[PDB]
Design a protein around this ligand. Sequence first.
Ligand SMILES: Nc1ncnc2c1ncn2[C@@H]1O[C@H](CO)[C@@H](O)[C@H]1O
Ligand SMILES: Nc1ncnc2[nH]cnc12
Ligand SMILES: [Mg+2]
Ligand SMILES: [Mg+2]
Lengths: 263, 259
Amino acid sequence: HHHHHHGMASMRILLSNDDGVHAPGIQTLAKALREFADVQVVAPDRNRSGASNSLTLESSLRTFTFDNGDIAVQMGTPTDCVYLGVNALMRPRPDIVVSGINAGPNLGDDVIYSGTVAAAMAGRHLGFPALAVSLNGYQHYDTAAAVTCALLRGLSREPLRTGRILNVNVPDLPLAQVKGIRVTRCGSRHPADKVIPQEDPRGNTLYWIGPPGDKYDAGPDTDFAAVDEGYVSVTPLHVDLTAHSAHDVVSDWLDSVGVGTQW
Amino acid sequence: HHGMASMRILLSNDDGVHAPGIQTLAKALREFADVQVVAPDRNRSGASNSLTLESSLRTFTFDNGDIAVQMGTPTDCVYLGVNALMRPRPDIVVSGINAGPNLGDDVIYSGTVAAAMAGRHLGFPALAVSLNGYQHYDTAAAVTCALLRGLSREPLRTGRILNVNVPDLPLAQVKGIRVTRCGSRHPADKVIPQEDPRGNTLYWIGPPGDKYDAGPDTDFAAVDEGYVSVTPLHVDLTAHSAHDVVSDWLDSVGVGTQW
Ligand SMILES: Nc1ncnc2c1ncn2[C@@H]1O[C@H](CO)[C@@H](O)[C@H]1O
Ligand SMILES: Nc1ncnc2[nH]cnc12
Ligand SMILES: [Mg+2]
Ligand SMILES: [Mg+2]
């Protein structure tokens, strides 16, 4: 009939985040996805920014269902949410996990700390590649929602053959000002070094973790560079932490220092 | 003592400050190095690279000088150790000895690995050390000490984190070391539901998926064959091999192009 999307409920999406179920990023995105997808939100009960791929192992998890059908996992991490949503809670099972929209970027080596990214990585085995979506700010959730809907419509047109996780960072701009899209690699930062002390009412010093370090590798092929230049950044991710290129150096080093070998 | 300089180690873990793995290791390391423990106050296995951002962190210092971070994650402990609690900054982070392995694609969830990753910008590559069981902490301590002597004999030029898994055997039975890559598992899919006394269903995370990639060059295979597995890790999660396929895909579906 000619509509922007084919089907009002053609894809089953598990939508999660790490800002928590009440966050404007996930709620704005849910409203956009519900136009064309069958969406089930399964997200943390509060802001779990910084949760990375942490899992709850020593306790069981309780869920809470809101009047609108959204599910919070109480005390749940983003990884808990996706793991339970895929493997226990959702029927039918999701075709895809979408995680976001996060309030703030997930770029460079920040990605391994990101609970937004971790929710997506917990969906890497599904029929479509998982999407992690982060806004470089707090102002244009509508832009990030539009980019996400475009990517999802793209997946309906042709399957993506390689890459199981897409880390998407959206500039905080009206859509008409976004320049385009770049496929990027993760940049990197200097080590974060700030600790912010704050005395409690009894005079004891407590410590706040400081902000990320300055950009270090923010070259033209990086996610940083794309966002900074007004492009959407798309970086395909994987979970293999092996530094493959260090293999021979490490082997030769062990031999040279006689650890593992008698001579 | 012997060299021109003492090695100054920040030692952490995620089993908790009182765990036998970290205390066994601390005793061994203090024979030759200056050791500062900064570790979670409790078992935080599965903490991955999580960071406490929502609250400030409280520390406790024990009579022996060990520092526990109350509700701190392993990454929190290393962050506070490197940036506030040790002056000057440590030479190296050593994390472990973990009670149990950290192998294959499970490494991304490991708080033992995360503490080592948090030390990746120091003067020596960080060590994460995990015992494939609970008996031979002594074996894993001896292996760690050997690596640390190794790092002071010649610099390791490439690789900022070494993930070390030690078979749970007496030292005499360990065959040697293999430099490995992380193996992988099938998708984990088991949830263990248990009702509370009111009939509400609560959910436990189940066992990992069965091994998928666990052949000859993997960390799994090394440990199974009685070798220490050493895998260099990095924090760049980019799937570089997918770049062209993703770019061509976007073009083919008209996302980011008018044509
Ligand atoms: N000290 C820090 N180290 C790393 N990431 C930080 C820090 N402070 C804030 N963040 C950001 O918060 C996000 C939560 O994971 C991280 O992705 C990271 O970019
Ligand atoms: N069930 C599980 N799934 C994924 N990672 C794990 N690490 C420990 N248990 C796990
Ligand atoms: Mg967040
Ligand atoms: Mg542990």
